[PDB]
A paper describes a structure:
We determined the structure of VpOmpM1 expressed in E. coli by single-particle cryo-EM. Reconstructions up to 3.2 Å without enforced symmetry revealed a trimeric arrangement of the protomers. An unusual feature observed in the cryo-EM reconstructions was a weaker, elongated density that corresponds to the N-terminal SLH domain at the distal part, connected to the β-barrel via a triple coiled-coil. We term this periplasmic region of VpOmpM1 the ‘stalk’. Only the region of the stalk proximal to the OM was resolved well enough for model building, as the cryo-EM density deteriorates towards the SLH domain end of the stalk. We speculated that the poor density is the result of movement of the stalk relative to the β-barrels. Measurements of the blurry SLH domain density observed in 2D class averages suggest that the distal part of the stalk spans 50–60 Å. In reconstructions without enforced symmetry, the α-helices forming the coiled-coil are not equivalent in either dataset, as they exit the OM plane in different orientations. In the E. coli VpOmpM1 structure, the sidechain of R113 in one protomer interacts with the sidechain of N155 (part of the periplasmic end of the β2 strand) of another protomer. This interaction is observed only in two inter-protomer interfaces, but not the third one.
Most diderm phyla from the Terrabacteria group have recently been shown to lack well-characterised OM attachment systems, but instead have [name], which could represent an ancestral tethering system in bacteria. [name] consists of an N-terminal periplasmic S-layer homology (SLH) domain connected via a linker region to a C-terminal OM β-barrel. Here we use single particle cryo-EM, X-ray crystallography, molecular dynamics simulations, bioinformatic analyses and functional assays to show that [name] from [name] (VpOmpM1) is a general porin with similar structural and functional properties to E. coli OmpF, with an additional mobile periplasmic region that can bind [name] PG and take on different folds.
Numbering used by the authors:
A (entry chain B), B (entry chain A), C (entry chain C): 100 to 420
Write the structure that this text describes.
Amino acid sequence: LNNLGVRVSRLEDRVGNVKVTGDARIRYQGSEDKGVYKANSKSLTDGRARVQFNANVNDKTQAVVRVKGNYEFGDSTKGSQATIDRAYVDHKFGSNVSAKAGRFQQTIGGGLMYDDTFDGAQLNVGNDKVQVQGAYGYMIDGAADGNSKSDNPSVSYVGLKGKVGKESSVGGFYSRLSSGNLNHNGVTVNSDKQDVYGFNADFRKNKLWAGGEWLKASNVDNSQAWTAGLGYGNYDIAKKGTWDVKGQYFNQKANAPIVSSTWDQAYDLTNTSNGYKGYMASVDYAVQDNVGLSAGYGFNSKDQSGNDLSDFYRAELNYKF
Amino acid sequence: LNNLGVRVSRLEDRVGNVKVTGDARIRYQGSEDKGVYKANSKSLTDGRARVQFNANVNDKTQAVVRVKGNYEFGDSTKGSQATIDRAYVDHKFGSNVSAKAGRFQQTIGGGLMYDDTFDGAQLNVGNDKVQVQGAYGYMIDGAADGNSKSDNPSVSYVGLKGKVGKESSVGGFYSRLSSGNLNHNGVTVNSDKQDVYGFNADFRKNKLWAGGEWLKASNVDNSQAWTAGLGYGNYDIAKKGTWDVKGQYFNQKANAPIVSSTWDQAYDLTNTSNGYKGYMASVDYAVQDNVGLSAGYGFNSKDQSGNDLSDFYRAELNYKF
Amino acid sequence: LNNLGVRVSRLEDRVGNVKVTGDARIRYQGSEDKGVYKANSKSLTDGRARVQFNANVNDKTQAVVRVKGNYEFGDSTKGSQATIDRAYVDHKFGSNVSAKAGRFQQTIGGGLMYDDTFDGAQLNVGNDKVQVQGAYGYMIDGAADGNSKSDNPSVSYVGLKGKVGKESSVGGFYSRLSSGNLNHNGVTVNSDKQDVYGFNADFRKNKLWAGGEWLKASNVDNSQAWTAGLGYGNYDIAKKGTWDVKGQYFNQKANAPIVSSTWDQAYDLTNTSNGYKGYMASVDYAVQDNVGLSAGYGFNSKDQSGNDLSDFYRAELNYKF
């Protein structure tokens, strides 16, 4: 028993404050019309490998550094360059107040508008039912990609979230964006300030999910965007046999601010100049522990004027380390 | 005893599923003529640092992510880029069948044609006496570098390996390459379908080794290539004092497909227009545990028409950690 | 207990020779005149994340591989590319002789002339009170950035460091630079050989600190550069509540070689065409364990001819993993 203890103690020397996690993904995307996912083609098979380091700076602060690498199956034009996707420090100023600083992931509202990289600061105040999240910074991925410091609109976001029921939650959000460059239909246009505001709901009872979100720019005409979805399943990547099915509908207008949505819709501000309106059915199945298989079929895609867009379909495998 | 276990649990809370290995290399290469290794010069001293993360997704699957960085001693034009060299998932479908998916390392035959990065899928059926390996994908390195997905020649490879006696192994392979752009003597030229079939043998007894390989494209004339080598030693980088010496003759014709050979000759389809034929003597010595000094000298280098080529020589330090 | 013993051994299987450390910095720099820190702007808010893998090749050798990623808050033109900052091997040939090989950090003398990346070899002979350091290689960062191998000036450095008390140490250094391209005021000018020689001294009685450094090129005229500073504090980033204040003065002539100094003056060989002469006050405070807030204000900046220069000021937060 004593010797074993010593053999434990030596391990305590080698292990540090950094825990290494990560994930891998092999994805296939396709559409009935060329150009939706890859230029001058109607298919795209790619892969991604992310390695994350969670470091315990001390007992009240932690940092996260994520290194990602994307590649296409057969694309040898350039090497799979490694990029720092996440680099931020998280502080716990008590049992309620929390803070984040650096390049982290921000979700503007319910994720329909933005659920991706964010350069700036974030604050969180709330115990168990009411949570106020306040972020200040700049968007990175999505239609806000390719902009410089002077040309990148600054987001001031405040979001209220309330826990109604056991695992159901409602909420709202109010964001203000300064004038800056945004990617509309493949061209960078300098847009004025916007006052986006929105509401969302997510009711989940015993393997039945019903979610919805509606956002609108206060000072921009025909700029609202909403989504509504239902689903059944108990998906969890860490347990075998856990599946999930869901069907949702997206109706977003021409001027609706959709930089990089959380959902796997193929049409957003970057792709469409006259809105998007259509359904999408997604299926997930944990084939093994920490190995999940996802499929998705987006159909009935149309513009806001009835013009018929192109369908799309995805199939991906995600491995969690 | 309960406390000790708690300690172990804390270690299991921090160690995770990712094991970090890696290696480093300090290499010098030279030749008697300019342009063999570095443009407009006859020497190249460089270094490489690779860090590999091996993650146990579950009992029957693991993933590998390798971050590689090359640099040249004194070259400060660009920072040492970090590139995702390997990113793949390995599945064990029982005691015999195994599968690989993603960006891995493929060895087409004995390694003379290609032993390097590969984007696609691999399926191994093993019996500890006879092994079958089938790969479908794209070459990423060597003469296949600089190609897009629409120009990269797809490879469909099937290889058999028979373990004759103990530690000795023979084998063969048949591969089909689709039409695509290949780098012939620095010029990207489009080539039609090719059928590369070959055999190899590797007889190791006591401390002596004798190997050979022969491959040929069925529908292309003047594409036959082969190598034959003899060596003596017991090299193992993790064991100090283990040495090794070998001498091998390479004879590859003008149109022989040699994308990225597993050996260290400096002439493979990318810097030759009329073939290669010559000897190469290599020496290895584990100076310390996990440290190895390798040297090589390639001489009698000639084209297939009798015209002389440039001799070359290498000296490298490999640190394994 | 046998069940526990199997677990602990498993940990030793999943814990290799690589220990992962790192740091994360969030920095703000600014000046009263545009262009000191960023083009056409008098401010720069950036962040950096470094992850270092310290390996143990064996009991007498150890390698280091550092992956560094910089970004600017709001700059989305390019991803935060990961660069291999350090990649080298450290050998320990007894209790008095040590060596390094690869891309490491070199401090030429006291660091006023250069303390940054270095490609080459280093040898150390130390009597535990008198140390001799000899480095042969190339500069990679600072005014030597953007140079190829054929243009990078080779550096042959021999430095001596003696201890004259409990903490106070004096020393000197002699370095030889070959002909090469160096960045003077944004223009890459070719310069002949230089024979830099210099001295430095440091005294750390109690918490007081008094440091100084002088250096000059033997053949070039108007190349003398010196710094002298005082301070009081016990700054240790791993201890909460440890503060530090200091104030120093720099006097750098027009042709004084300041490639990448170890101090934080905003003016060096890359920014100054007629030298620099001014004061700088720095403050450090470890607000938390492994967290530190640093501030700096450089004022009275002037050319060697009396022409006024801009005043600079910075504030940063450093977290050690």
